[PDB]
Design a protein around this ligand. Structure first.
Ligand code: HEC
Ligand code: HEC
Ligand code: HEC
Length: 68
């Protein structure tokens, strides 16, 4: 899709898949080939979502992703 969300317990995490794609390229997330990714709590918080954004914008605590 162009937008997805992980409907997680906290507050659903929107991700403008398309946006990230056209803004960045593809490489950004899908090096070899896309076959899903399945970015969970661990991945997301560790080194996927909540690593990239550091140098781009400052979501300090939360809210950045979880719409809650
Ligand atoms: C990181 C911010 C991403 C960018 C940039 C792109 N994609 Fe992506 N993609 C990403 C995630 C986290 C997911 C998985 C969602 C899940 O359910 O696990 C995906 C998924 C895809 C898929 C699979 C869709 C499906 O029906 O399962 C495809 C085919 C895909 N992505 C392709 C794709 C392309 C072509 C992009 C660059 C041009 C692109 N993605 C960017 C994360 C990210
Ligand atoms: C984007 C950079 C994020 C920010 C900002 C925060 N979180 Fe997050 N979180 C994110 C994703 C993509 C996911 C995936 C959902 C999953 O469970 O795999 C998560 C997940 C969590 C979870 C687990 C929720 C569940 O349903 O089990 C927790 C407990 C969580 N996140 C907490 C949390 C808090 C407290 C934040 C501020 C400190 C926060 N998240 C920010 C993406 C992002
Ligand atoms: C680094 C290449 C990125 C990865 C990997 C992820 N995101 Fe991202 N995100 C990135 C940028 C450059 C931006 C800002 C775009 C702009 O126009 O300036 C964003 C923005 C978001 C947003 C909005 C946050 C805001 O500042 O308003 C969301 C909701 C978001 N990103 C979610 C998200 C998730 C959950 C990711 C892991 C699956 C993720 N992003 C990865 C760059 C990058």
């Amino acid at each position: 899709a162009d937008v997805v969300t992980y409907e997680n317990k906290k507050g659903n995490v929107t991700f403008d898949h398309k946006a990230h794609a056209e803004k960045l390229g593809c490489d950004a997330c899908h090096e070899g080939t896309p076959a899903k990714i399945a970015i969970d709590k661990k991945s997301a918080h560790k080194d996927a979502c909540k690593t990239c954004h550091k140098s781009n914008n400052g979501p300090t605590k939360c809210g950045g992703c979880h719409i809650k």
